[PDB]
């Protein structure tokens, strides 16, 4: 028997399936980009989803069902998530660097101005502003959800969490429409390049964040969370705030100042 | 800042719900009003075959290789101009 | 007249190793000037200085490409 | 405005999480979450080192703020002394799980 | 429980030093040979 | 550090064999490719 | 049982072992590539072909040595094996995620070998600068496979960094503060922080290259208003921290080896060593443009980068002198590990000083893209990082295996390698000052002497690598089991026997707070 | 150019390159000093049976080995920065010449007065005339007037390249879409060599730079004849 | 809904020596075999594709 509070995880096949799924997706992308075939990519995306599902399922089994998450294990998970979010911030930073580098010294090919000649930016006061109020609102509602959970109120936790998710979905739908309606494309020089790749990666994070919240929603439905132990929910909320903050920077930099 | 409201005697669940329905959602309602108002399809600009736009260094891995992923015929011209 | 040009002199507006904007600025200036003069009924000879400077600094292929674009109606710069 | 329906740790915590939670309520530390406080470390007042076997590795921080930690196995039996500062440690074996 | 101790905490067997020599030879030899053959591969394409 | 005597002593003869085999596993494949280098360049 | 243990592992020692195996194999690949480079430069004229095939070799050599040999061995191998043991922890904080960090490497390696197999390979330099790396000058899958290889290696290292930082911060005995943890543990944590912050920038940059190559973006394409120089900034923002990521764990192991073989219970000036590694880590984030002194930057910017780069010599100097001060008054044990450590101290100092010569943008104008830079980095990497790896390997091998090496053979191995690396790289300083450019398959006739000598030196090094393999075989073939190890009171990792059991610290250590 | 078995820098052809030679001598002395001092102290620590294994105090000796290195860094930076700003001084050139990098050769343009331009390729080894340098000779040299301040502008029309002439202390990257500036000034007539200094593909090793420095009078007649 | 966490806790703490990823029942085994089969097969296929792409088709 162990006399420390840490978790010794059972030998697992997920790390391997995750690694291989990484190989299938990258290989798949290469086959798609060059040998016009999505077969590998399809299998890769599939094993990847399967790996994530089973791995996080096991984490739920180990914590909610088996009780391996002592305060020390939970403390470690907190550091893990904070560190993960920091690396995501640095990833976005590279894209904001690319944006500012291009926009601050427009080359002659763009007409030596920003936005480039021939680019008609979206009005920041229209959908982009709506998108901003949607994310900020979801930031408030998820805080309501957290307080409800900690005060032991099941119904209101579910209500607030639902509202948060709906808002995330609303943002996603609005952004998808904005993408379709935009007179510029990803191929429209560095403007389109920075615009779509930055907002595109942000959009992907919104989808990941929403998914994470939805997972919390169902775990909440099944009574997994106690008024005091609910790290999965706390992490999703932190991640959600990150997504919300990245948007505010995108909005201020690309949509507003960059127009 | 401090906003222009007050509470702070104890920020709890009732307070955050008060904010969700009394400030946050109403703000989203107003912006939704404003947006679904200033919309209306704006007259697509004359096409000019600028060399820094409609970039094509390699065909796209989909369709005929010449259409962007979320191509909108109405507002997105091809390297050769708007579509039929 | 007031010329006797050897090469483009130091320009305090572009004192660094990157001279891309110096070439570009002078090319724009000359073509802007040339337009104002040919328009309002005047002589392009006043625009001479900019033509000498841009000719000295600018790579032949750049001037060449920009000329082709002004003709095609695709020159991104404002003239 | 309010209601219930959310389980508590007291009602739902299980496994090791529950053990740590219950032991902590009785003021005990079976899972070594806390740093033990030192006795005077003399021959008469040795540092009591709990263990569930007949030996445990002891790490001695001789003087407060030393960066070097002195490590050694403390065996069951007569008290042993830190090879560096000589303070005494005595193993007090077994149990934990009833 | 997994085997513990010298020669038991590794993915390869050290029971027979000659079989071991063969394994190590293949292992390290394959790594060292790879670039030479990849080079040969690139020369024989064009 | 102290250690017990070799459980399966490797004699000088055995060491020459292991060393030779080792050196050869590195040298032969590469040597083969490098030797036929001209046969590769133009073929 | 075999698959459960080696494919589904959740044990830090077994995972560390997988890492050392991967890294040793990668080392052979990197060595073969390096011999191909020196065979080509061995005599004037063309041996392999034009610069393309040659540069695909130079590129892979660097990626293999850096991402597949050094990082896996130091951080994945030594890090996983030693860190939990040195803080008395039962395992890493995320033992299952730890296994994925490992398993992402073979796929990443496979993608690298693939890129060299398809088309004409990626002959771009390990820096992968566009437009040469773009879809026009390097059309085809090669550069894309290279980018993907980096992505996988990057995810592996970022997850590994999160694991190490969490483990080191959260799993030490309750009484042990960060100022009571060994210097190797400190070196690994600082390295993890640099990895955490720098790799995402590289990921951003290479993703932009991928989209320029496949989705018609123009981040680095002037035609769309892009800039090739933007890529350089993004790459080097990661690139400089990366070199400190490659040396920090080495510094950590050197501190343990020198302390140990000096018969000392602790390194001289512990807090000064911690301060030095933290300062170097910090400064390593604000000096990147020293890799861009000829791209055409403002003079003030060049003046700043020259100055900021030089400052790194101060904290690095404190480490050098502290290692010497650790030797001072010691009962010196002339073991093979100590020999690697002493060679490290001197050779690293030499490479570090030539790095200070290169910091001067004025001189760098003439030295940039010449063999003087190649000489600098091989002294710090092929002598510094590699010597620390060899020293740590011989020192800890008995702990990992339970067997001892033949000390005489290990000393012979050190002697051969020492002559080989110095004969290989020392003449390269001459080639650099006299103007021989980097990445050339052939050179003007005047450069023949030094290139001939350098290539000969590289063969001596090959002989040392082959000998090393034999030596490891001899250890496993003879089976001399370890009995006793000295100084275990200040080297906790040896306290559970050789090799330690699968499960260590099931019952944590006892540490009074006082 | 470099000669067989050369140890240091090619002889300085311009005042700036001379400057760097002296700065390098200065720095190298410091490098030799510190590396030999470290080698010495290592041998000193390892050659005595005397021992002292107890705790040694650090906050005192650390001052010395923090202040000394800081001073030495300043002694390197001062002359380094002085030369850096010197290379940046306004000088007002008499001539401007542009060079475009290409895969794999350089083209030159002297467009101050006439529109003169030409390509510059490496002379194949099989076509070298007796006494000519393998990998270094070009068909058309960059004729320039000696003892005059010239402005060189560098760019590229494809991938990256880098225009270098060691003897003059020059190296400026050739980046497409960018126009990099550097000044050249030879104190003597002659032929000065350099090679492409940025990996650019298949023939990166084979696209040299050859400068021919002659008196202004010959430069002018050459320009005319070259139209 | 009703709280059935206690049932799940009993099922997953049942001393059957099964690793957490299979401790749920026969479905775990199926999903696992599906995942691993796609992973391994997909990997073999990728090796095939690499072999294919390694050679020129002129
Ligand atoms: C292998 C080829 C050698 C060719 C030698 C020269 C032939 C000269 C002919 C005929 C000589 C006379 C006529 C020509 C004079 C030219 C002066 C010149 O233009 O001047 C500049 C030149 C020439 O500099 C010289 O004036 C040569 C200096 C050589 C120092 C050698 C140390 C060698 C140690 C062991 C042997 C080498 C391998 C191991 C090296 C280990 C690292 C140093 O270029 C350099 O700067 C090269 C060095 C770059 C910097 C390395 C810095 C740290 C190095 C060593 C510290 C060791 C301290 C302890 C003391 C040393 C302890 C071991
Ligand atoms: C860690 C990094 C590393 C290492 C160790 C080496 C080692 C060597 N490298 Fe280098 N090299 C680079 C990183 C490295 N290199 C980089 C980054 C580049 C630049 C690429 C570019 O320009 O894009 C480069 C470029 C480069 C060039 C210049 C190419 C050119 O400009 O055209 C040359 C030329 O001689 C060269 C030679 C060598 C040689 C002969 C060795 C030899 O010293 C090697 C000897 C063998 C070993 C040291 C391996 C030992 C380690 C093990 C095998 C582990 C053993 C197992 C256990 C102990 C578990 N390298
Ligand atoms: C282990 C890896 C490693 C490490 C630690 C370093 C450390 C340093 N490097 Fe280096 N470097 C590389 C790997 C490494 N480097 C690589 C791979 C490249 C080429 C990349 C490529 O282009 O592919 C390179 C390139 C490179 C350049 C670019 C040159 C060019 O391309 O033109 C420069 C520029 O300043 C430089 C500087 C330095 C400096 C100042 C240090 C300093 O950190 C060194 C500090 C150490 C000391 C100074 C010695 C000890 C100190 C004392 C004994 C005290 C007294 C000292 C003084 C008072 C001076 N390095
Ligand atoms: C123009 C750019 C554009 C891009 C911008 C994009 C986005 C903007 C940026 C950020 C916004 C995003 C999300 C913010 C919301 C939530 C984050 C979660 C924080 C949280 O809620 O933290 C809590 C407490 O603070 C704690 O952790 C404190 C402990 C922290 C531990 C982790 C840190 C360790 C890593 C290395 C240490 C650094 C050392 C500092 C000294 C160095 C000197 C140079 C949780 O507790 P815990 O871990 O148990 O710690 C115990 C301490 N009480
Ligand atoms: C609805 C909002 C949410 C955005 C994401 C949703 C759907 C797109 C699919 C995947 C996107 C994920 C990340 C972003 C990657 C590239 C930018 C895509 C952003 C986007 O969707 O941009 C679109 C371009 O689509 C394109 O090329 C996209 C082409 C799709 C192929 C994806 C390419 C895959 C490359 C991925 C690289 C992976 C490397 C990541 C590494 C991470 C760290 C290691 C914009 O459309 P457009 O018609 O040009 O303009 C509209 C005109 N009416
Ligand atoms: C095509 C667009 C798509 C739309 C956007 C997408 C997603 C949004 C998703 C979901 C949110 C909407 C409604 C939530 C529904 C039911 C909540 C049920 C509980 C309830 O009725 O809550 C009540 C308040 O809610 C309530 O008025 C409900 C509150 C509704 C608020 C918004 C309405 C605004 C009205 C106009 C005011 C504007 C003026 C501005 C003033 C300045 C602001 C500072 C309080 O009651 P109780 O007695 O204390 O509680 C007992 C336990 N339930
Ligand atoms: C941060 C706190 C420390 C404070 C120290 C200051 C350091 C960085 C912040 C300063 C950034 C703004 C400066 C811009 C002002 C100059 C405008 C400009 O023009 O700079 C431009 C680039 O700036 C650009 O993108 C700049 C892009 C950003 C590069 C900086 C990299 C650091 C980012 C990583 C940090 C992670 C932080 C986590 C976030 C919460 C272009 O370069 P020029 O050379 O001019 O070329 C023009 C030529 O034609 C003529 O020579
Ligand atoms: C179309 C949609 C597909 C897109 C792909 C990605 C899809 C979904 C990603 C969403 C992430 C879902 C994560 C679910 C995690 C569930 C496991 C969980 O939440 O596990 C919790 C621990 O946290 C934990 O491991 C925390 C686990 C951290 C996971 C967060 C990581 C986000 C993943 C991002 C990956 C992409 C990176 C960006 C790309 C550029 C369990 O502890 P508690 O909650 O305290 O419970 C215990 C109590 O019941 C006791 O009484
Ligand atoms: C070109 C395309 C390239 C594609 C590359 C894709 C690479 C891999 C894809 C497949 C990987 C997905 C599988 C799920 C991974 C979950 C890891 C996780 O959730 O790990 C957790 C730790 O990290 C934590 O918390 C906090 C950290 C959460 C990390 C989530 C993992 C996401 C992986 C993507 C990372 C991208 C890096 C972002 C910066 C660019 C839990 O740790 P374990 O050791 O398991 O358990 C410990 C037990 O005590 C739990 O009870
Ligand atoms: C790091 C996380 C990111 C990982 C990588 C992201 C993966 C993105 C997948 C994109 O895949 C797709 O690609 C297509 C191309 O194969 C589409 O089909 C399409 O393409 C065609 C094939 O030519 C046409 O037949 C159709 O009209 C259609 O639009 C398409 O719908 C979409 O699903
Ligand atoms: C950079 C690392 C490389 C270091 C240098 C390698 C050292 C020498 C290795 C010996 O290698 C070989 O020697 C041969 C010649 O001596 C070959 O025989 C060949 O040559 C013959 C005899 O000349 C024939 O008998 C056979 O057909 C044959 O192909 C050849 O196959 C190869 O195994
Ligand atoms: C059934 C459950 C009550 C608690 C319980 O499960 O016993 C109720 C209470 C609150 C939840 C609801 C919240 O009021 C929020 C949502 C509001 C509705 O418009 C749709 C469903 C909605 C998403 C939720 C579904 C509903 O079934 C929930 C889950
Ligand atoms: C105060 C701190 C920690 C001391 C401790 O708590 O033990 C110590 C550790 C290392 C010391 C630093 C290093 O010794 C390097 C520098 C040495 C000079 O003597 C003074 C400043 C100098 C920058 C030191 C300042 C300070 O005393 C530091 C930062
Ligand atoms: Cu042009 Cu190298
Ligand atoms: Cu650097
Ligand atoms: Mg360069
Ligand atoms: Na050659
Ligand atoms: Zn003590």
Task: For chain H, list the domains and their CATH numbers.
Answer: 2-91 (1.10.287.90), 92-227 (2.60.40.420)
**Per the annotation, does G233 bind a ligand?**
no
| 8 A C-beta contact, residue G220 and residue H178 | no
Say which of D2, D8, D13 has its CB closest to residue A67: D13
Which residues of chain A are within 8 Å of residue I40 when distances are taken between CB atoms? 20
Q: Which residues make beta-bridge pairs with H180?
A: C18, H154
Please work out whether the CB of residue A184 comes within 6 Å of at least one atom of ligand 4: no
Query: Residue with structure tokens 């951003």?
Result: G204
Q: How many domains does chain I have?
A: 1
Query: Residue with structure tokens 């090669």?
Result: G142
What HEC string does C43-67 produce?
A: CHHHHHHHHHHHHHHCCHHHHHHHH
> With an 8 Å Cβ cutoff, are D12 and I13 in contact?
no
Q: Which residues make beta-bridge pairs with F2?
A: G484
Count of beta carbons in the 10 Å neighbourhood of residue H153: 25
**C-alpha span between A186 and A195 (Å, rounded):** 8
> With an 8 Å Cβ cutoff, are G216 and B61 in contact?
no
Say which of D57, D64, D67 has its CB closest to residue G514: D64
CATH 1.10.10.140 for domain C1-79: yes
**C-alpha span between E21 and E15 (Å, rounded):** 11
Domain that includes residue B56, residue range: 1-84
Please work out whether the CB of residue G373 comes within 6 Å of at least one atom of ligand 3: yes
Instruction: Record the tokens describing residue G263, joined without a space.
Output: 């018969």
Q: What share of chain G is helix, strand, coil (3-state, %, to 5)?
A: 70, 0, 25
**C-alpha span between G85 and G78 (Å, rounded):** 11
Domain that includes residue I38, residue range: 1-58
Ligand 10 atom, smallest distance to B62 CA: 23
Closest CA to H97 of C6, G292, C64: C6
Please work out whether the CB of residue H63 comes within 6 Å of at least one atom of ligand 13: yes
Ligand 4, residues A72, A76, A82: which to mutate, most atoms within 8 A of Cβ?
Answer: A82
Q: How many domains does chain G have?
A: 1
Determine if the peptide bond prior to G375 is cis (ω within 30°): no
Are β-strands D55-60 and G510-511 bridged in parallel, bridged antiparallel, or unpaired? parallel
Query: Residue with structure tokens 């094993």?
Result: A47
CATH number of the domain bearing residue E31: 4.10.49.10
Ligand 14 atom, smallest distance to G439 CA: 2
I1, I2, I3, I7: which to substitute to probe chain D, counting the most D Cβ within 10 Å? Answer: I3
**C-alpha span between H89 and C19 (Å, rounded):** 15
> With an 8 Å Cβ cutoff, are B28 and A167 in contact?
yes
Which residues of chain D are within 8 Å of residue B14 when distances are taken between CB atoms? 1-2
| 8 A C-beta contact, residue G79 and residue G388 | no
Instruction: Record the tokens describing residue H129, joined without a space.
Output: 């005339």
Count of beta carbons in the 10 Å neighbourhood of residue A208: 13
**Strands laid side by side in the D70-75 sheet:** D70-75, D55-60, G510-511
Closest CA to C59 of H210, A107, H93, H181: H181
| Whether A219 contacts chain D with CB within 8 A | no
Please work out whether the CB of residue G271 comes within 6 Å of at least one atom of ligand 13: yes
Q: How many domains does chain F have?
A: 1
| 8 A C-beta contact, residue G230 and residue G289 | no
Q: How big is chain I, counted in residues?
A: 58
Closest CA to F10 of G508, G9, H179, G404: G404
Query: Residue with structure tokens 């080639």?
Result: G431
Please work out whether the CB of residue A155 comes within 6 Å of at least one atom of ligand 12: yes
Domains plus CATH for chain A?
1-68 (1.10.287.70), 69-259 (1.20.120.80)
If you take atom 35 of ligand 9, which residue's CA is the nearest one?
Answer: G155
| Whether G321 contacts chain H with CB within 8 A | yes
What's phi and psi for G238, nearest 5 deg? Answer: -90, -45
Please calculate the CA angle C1-C7-C13 and round it to the nearest 5 degrees: 100
Which residues of chain B are within 8 Å of residue A182 when distances are taken between CB atoms? 70, 72, 75
Measured in Å, residue I48 CA sits from the centre of ligand 11 at 32
What's phi and psi for G421, nearest 5 deg? Answer: -65, -40
Helices (H), ranges, A105-188? 127-150, 154-181
| 8 A C-beta contact, residue A28 and residue A43 | yes
Instruction: Record the tokens describing residue G478, joined without a space.
Output: 């003879």
Q: Which residues make beta-bridge pairs with D50?
A: D92
Q: Which ligand is nearest to the CA of G278?
A: 4
Count of beta carbons in the 10 Å neighbourhood of residue H226: 13
Ligand 9 atom, smallest distance to G203 CA: 40
Domains plus CATH for chain D?
1-98 (2.60.11.10)
**C-alpha span between G320 and G335 (Å, rounded):** 20
Residue G223 to residues A113, A189, G91, H176: CA-CA distances in angstroms? 14, 8, 53, 9
The burial of H3, by beta-carbon neighbours within 10 Å (0-12 exposed, 13-18 middle, 19 or more buried), is given as exposed
If you take atom 12 of ligand 1, which residue's CA is the nearest one?
Answer: H7
Ligand 10 atom, smallest distance to B63 CA: 23
Q: What is the CA radius of gyration of chain G?
A: 23
In three-state secondary structure terms, E23 is helix
In three-state secondary structure terms, H194 is strand
| Whether G331 contacts chain H with CB within 8 A | yes
Say which of B16, B51, B75 has its CB closest to residue A144: B16
| Residues surrounding ion ligand 16 at CB below 5 Å | G 369; H 198
Q: G502 to chain E nearest CA, in Å?
A: 7
**C-alpha span between D61 and D42 (Å, rounded):** 16
Please work out whether the CB of residue F16 comes within 6 Å of at least one atom of ligand 11: no
Residues A132, A137, A143, A146: what is their CA dihedral angle, to the nearest 10 degrees?
Answer: -110
**C-alpha span between A247 and A133 (Å, rounded):** 11
Q: G117 to chain I nearest CA, in Å?
A: 5
Instruction: Record the tokens describing residue A144, joined without a space.
Output: 């309501």
Phi/psi region, residue B10 (left: phi>0; alpha: psi -120 to 50; beta: rest), is left
| 8 A C-beta contact, residue G324 and residue H91 | no
Helices (H), ranges, chain I? 5-13, 26-54
Q: How many domains does chain B have?
A: 1
Count of beta carbons in the 10 Å neighbourhood of residue A166: 14
Measured in Å, residue A178 CA sits from the centre of ligand 8 at 29
**C-alpha span between H128 and A95 (Å, rounded):** 51
In three-state secondary structure terms, D60 is strand
| Residues surrounding ion ligand 18 at CB below 5 Å | D 60, 62, 70, 82, 84-85
> With an 8 Å Cβ cutoff, are D15 and I3 in contact?
no
Domain that includes residue F2, residue range: 1-43
Please work out whether the CB of residue H98 comes within 6 Å of at least one atom of ligand 14: no
Query: Residue with structure tokens 């082959």?
Result: G466
Instruction: Record the tokens describing residue G475, joined without a space.
Output: 């250890």
Are β-strands H116-120 and H161-165 bridged in parallel, bridged antiparallel, or unpaired? unpaired
| Whether A218 contacts chain D with CB within 8 A | no
Determine if the peptide bond prior to A115 is cis (ω within 30°): yes
**Per the annotation, does G413 bind a ligand?**
no
Domain that includes residue E3, residue range: 1-46
Q: How was this structure determined?
A: X-ray
CATH number of the domain bearing residue I27: 4.10.91.10
Which residues of G form the catalytic set?
61, 91, 126, 156-157, 240, 242, 244, 255, 290-291, 316, 319, 438
If you take atom 36 of ligand 9, which residue's CA is the nearest one?
Answer: G155
Q: Which residues, other chains included, contact G352 with Cβ-Cβ below 8 Å and sequence gap of 6+?
A: G313, G316, G380
**Per the annotation, does G376 bind a ligand?**
yes
Ligand 14 atom, smallest distance to H159 CA: 1
Closest CA to G225 of D91, A88, A110: A110
Which residues of chain A are within 8 Å of residue G93 when distances are taken between CB atoms? 6, 76, 79-80
Annotated binding site of D for Zn(2+): 60, 62, 82, 85
**C-alpha span between H181 and H162 (Å, rounded):** 12
Query: Residue with structure tokens 């016009």?
Result: A36
User: Chain E: residue nearest G36 by CA?
Assistant: E36
Count of beta carbons in the 10 Å neighbourhood of residue H132: 11
Q: How big is chain G, counted in residues?
A: 514
Instruction: Record the tokens describing residue H107, joined without a space.
Output: 């083209």
**C-alpha span between H69 and I1 (Å, rounded):** 72
Closest CA to D50 of D23, D22, D29, D27: D29
> With an 8 Å Cβ cutoff, are A44 and I23 in contact?
no
Please work out whether the CB of residue H66 comes within 6 Å of at least one atom of ligand 13: yes
CATH number of the domain bearing residue G323: 1.20.210.10
Q: How many domains does chain E have?
A: 1
| Whether H151 contacts chain C with CB within 8 A | yes
| 8 A C-beta contact, residue G182 and residue G147 | no
| Whether G229 contacts chain H with CB within 8 A | yes
CATH number of the domain bearing residue F42: 4.10.81.10
**C-alpha span between G94 and A244 (Å, rounded):** 28
């Amino acid at each position: 028997h162990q006399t420390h509070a840490y978790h010794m995880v059972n030998p697992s096949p997920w790390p391997l399936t995750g690694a291989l799924s990484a190989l299938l997706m990258t290989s798949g992308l290469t086959m798609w980009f060059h040998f016009n075939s999505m077969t590998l990519l399809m299998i890769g995306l599939t094993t990847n989803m399967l790996t994530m599902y089973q791995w996080w399922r096991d984490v739920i089994r180990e914590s909610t069902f088996q009780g391996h998450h002592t305060p020390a294990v939970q403390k470690g998970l907190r550091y893990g998530m904070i560190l993960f979010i920091i690396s995501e911030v640095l990833f976005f930073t590279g894209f904001f660097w690319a944006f500012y580098h291009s926009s601050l010294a427009p080359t002659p090919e763009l007409g030596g101005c920003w936005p480039p000649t021939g680019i008609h930016p979206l009005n920041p006061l229209e959908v982009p502003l709506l998108n901003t109020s949607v994310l900020l609102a979801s930031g408030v509602s998820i805080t309501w959800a957290h307080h409800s959970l900690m005060e032991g109120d099941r119904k209101h936790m579910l209500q607030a969490l639902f509202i948060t998710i709906t808002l995330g979905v609303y943002f996603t739908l609005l952004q998808a429409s904005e993408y379709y309606e935009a007179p510029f494309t990803i191929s429209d020089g560095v403007y389109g390049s920075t615009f779509f790749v930055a907002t595109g990666f942000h959009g992907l994070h919104v989808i990941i964040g929403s998914t994470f919240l939805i997972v919390c929603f169902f775990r909440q439905l099944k009574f997994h969370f106690t008024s005091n132990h609910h790290f999965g929910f706390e992490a999703a909320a932190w991640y959600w705030h990150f997504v919300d903050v990245v948007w505010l920077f995108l909005y201020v930099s690309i949509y507003w100042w960059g127009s | 800042a401090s906003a222009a409201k007050g509470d702070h005697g104890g920020t709890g669940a009732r307070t955050w719900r008060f904010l969700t329905f009394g400030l946050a959602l109403p703000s989203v309602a107003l912006c939704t009003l404003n947006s679904w108002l200033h919309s209306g399809h704006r007259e697509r600009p004359a096409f000019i075959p600028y060399h820094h736009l409609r970039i094509r260094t390699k065909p796209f891995s989909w369709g005929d290789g010449n259409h962007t992923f979320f191509h909108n015929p109405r507002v997105n011209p091809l390297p050769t101009g708007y579509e039929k | 007249k007031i010329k006797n040009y050897q090469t483009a002199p130091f320009d305090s507006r572009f004192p660094n190793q990157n001279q891309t904007r110096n070439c570009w600025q002078n090319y724009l200036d000359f073509h802007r000037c040339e337009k104002a003069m040919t328009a309002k009924g005047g002589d392009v000879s006043v625009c001479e200085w900019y033509r000498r400077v841009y000719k000295s600094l600018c790579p032949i292929s750049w001037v060449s490409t920009w000329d082709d674009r002004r003709a095609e109606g695709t020159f991104p710069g404002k003239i | 405005a309010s209601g219930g329906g959310v389980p508590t740790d007291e009602e739902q915590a299980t496994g090791l999480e529950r053990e740590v939670m219950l032991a902590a309520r009785k003021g005990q530390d079976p899972y070594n979450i806390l740093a033990p406080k030192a006795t005077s470390g003399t021959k008469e007042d040795p540092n009591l080192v709990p263990s569930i076997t007949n030996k445990r590795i002891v790490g001695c921080i001789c003087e407060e703020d030393n960066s070097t930690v002195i490590w050694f196995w403390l065996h069951k039996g007569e008290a042993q002394r830190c090879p560096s500062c000589g303070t005494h440690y005595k193993l007090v074996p077994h149990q934990l799980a009833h | 429980h997994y085997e513990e101790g010298p020669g038991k905490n590794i993915p390869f067997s050290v029971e027979n030093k000659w079989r071991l020599l063969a394994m190590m030879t293949l292992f390290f030899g394959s790594g060292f040979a790879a670039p030479f053959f990849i080079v040969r591969h690139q020369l024989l394409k064009k | 550090i102290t250690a017990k005597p070799a459980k399966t002593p490797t004699s000088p003869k055995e060491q020459a064999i292991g060393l030779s085999v080792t050196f050869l596993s590195f040298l032969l494949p590469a040597g083969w490719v490098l030797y036929h280098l001209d046969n590769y360049k133009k073929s | 049982m075999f698959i459960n243990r080696w494919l589904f592992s959740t044990n830090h020692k077994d995972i560390g072992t997988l890492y050392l195996l991967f890294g040793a194999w990668a080392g052979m690949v990197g060595t073969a590539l390096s011999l191909l480079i020196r065979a080509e430069l061995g005599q004037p004229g063309t041996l392999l072909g034009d610069d393309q095939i040659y540069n695909v070799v130079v590129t892979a050599h660097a990626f293999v040595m850096i991402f597949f040999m050094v990082m896996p061995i130091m951080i994945g191998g030594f890090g996983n094996w030693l860190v939990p043991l040195m803080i008395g922890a039962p395992d890493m904080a995320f033992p299952r995620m730890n296994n994925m960090s490992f398993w992402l490497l073979p796929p990443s390696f496979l993608l690298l070998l693939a890129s060299s197999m398809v088309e004409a390979g990626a002959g771009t330099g390990w820096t992968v600068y566009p437009p040469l790396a773009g879809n026009l000058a390097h059309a085809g899958a090669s550069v894309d496979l290279t980018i993907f290889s980096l992505h996988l290696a990057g995810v592996s290292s970022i997850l590994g960094a999160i694991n190490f930082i969490t483990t080191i911060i959260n799993m030490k005995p309750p009484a042990m503060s960060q100022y009571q943890t060994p210097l190797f543990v400190w070196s690994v944590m600082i390295t993890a922080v640099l990895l955490l912050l720098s790799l995402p920038v590289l990921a951003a940059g290479i993703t932009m290259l991928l989209t320029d190559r496949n989705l018609n973006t123009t981040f680095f394409d002037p035609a769309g208003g892009g800039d090739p120089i933007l890529y350089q900034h993004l790459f080097w923002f990661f690139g400089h921290p990366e070199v400190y990521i490659l040396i920090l764990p080495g510094f950590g192991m050197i501190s343990h080896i020198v302390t140990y073989y000096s018969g000392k219970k602790e390194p001289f000036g512990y807090m000064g060593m911690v301060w030095a590694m933290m300062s170097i880590g910090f400064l390593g984030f604000i000096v990147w443009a020293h890799h861009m002194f000829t791209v055409g930057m403002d003079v003030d910017t060049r003046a700043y980068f020259t100055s900021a780069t030089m400052i790194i010599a101060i904290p690095t100097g404190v480490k050098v002198f502290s290692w010497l001060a650790t030797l001072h008054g010691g009962n010196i044990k002339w073991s093979p590990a100590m020999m690697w450590a002493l060679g490290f101290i001197f050779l690293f100092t030499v490479g570090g000083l030539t790095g200070i010569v290169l910091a001067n943008s004025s001189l760098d104008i003439v030295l940039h893209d010449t063999y003087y830079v190649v000489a600098h980095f091989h002294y710090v990497l092929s002598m510094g990082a590699v010597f620390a790896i060899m020293g740590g390997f011989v020192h800890w091998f008995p702990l990992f295996s339970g067997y001892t090496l033949n000390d005489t053979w290990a000393k012979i191995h050190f002697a051969i390698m020492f002559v080989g690396v110095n004969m290989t790289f020392f003449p390269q300083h001459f080639l650099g000052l006299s103007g021989m450019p980097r990445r050339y398959s052939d050179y003007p006739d005047a450069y023949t002497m030094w290139n001939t000598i350098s290539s000969m030196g590289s063969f001596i090094s090959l002989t040392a690598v082959m000998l090393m393999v034999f030596i490891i075989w001899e250890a496993f073939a003879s089976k001399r089991e370890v009995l006793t190890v000295d100084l275990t009171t200040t080297n906790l990792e040896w306290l559970n026997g050789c090799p330690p059991p699968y499960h260590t610290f099931e019952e944590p250590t006892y540490v009074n707070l006082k | 150019m470099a000669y067989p078995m050369q140890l240091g820098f090619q002889d300085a052809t311009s005042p700036i390159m001379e400057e760097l030679l002296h700065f390098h001598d200065h720095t190298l002395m410091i490098v030799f000093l510190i590396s030999s001092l470290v080698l010495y102290i290592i041998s000193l620590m390892l050659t005595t049976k005397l021992t002292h294994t107890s705790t040694m105090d650090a906050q005192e000796v650390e001052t010395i080995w923090t202040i000394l290195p800081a001073i030495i860094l300043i002694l390197i930076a001062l002359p380094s920065l002085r030369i850096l700003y010197m290379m940046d001084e306004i000088n007002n050139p008499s001539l401007t010449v542009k060079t475009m990098g290409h895969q794999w050769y350089w083209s030159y343009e002297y467009t101050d007065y006439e529109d003169l331009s030409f390509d510059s390729y490496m002379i194949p080894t099989s076509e070298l005339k007796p006494g000519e340098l393998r990998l270094l000779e070009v068909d058309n040299r960059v004729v320039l007037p000696m003892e005059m301040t010239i402005r060189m502008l560098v760019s590229s029309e494809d991938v990256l390249h880098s225009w270098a002439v060691p003897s003059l202390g020059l190296k400026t990257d050739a980046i497409p879409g960018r126009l990099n500036q550097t000044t050249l000034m030879s104190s003597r007539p002659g032929l000065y060599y350099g090679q492409c200094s940025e990996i650019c593909g298949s023939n990166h090793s084979f696209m040299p730079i050859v400068l021919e420095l002659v008196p202004l009078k010959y430069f002018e007649k050459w320009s005319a004849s070259m139209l | 809904f009703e709280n059935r966490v206690a049932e799940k806790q009993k099922l997953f703490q049942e001393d059957n020596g099964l690793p957490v990823h299979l401790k749920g029942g026969a479905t775990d085994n199926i999903l696992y075999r599906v995942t691993m089969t796609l992973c391994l097969g997909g990997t073999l296929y990728s090796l095939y594709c690499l072999g294919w792409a390694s050679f020129p088709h002129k």
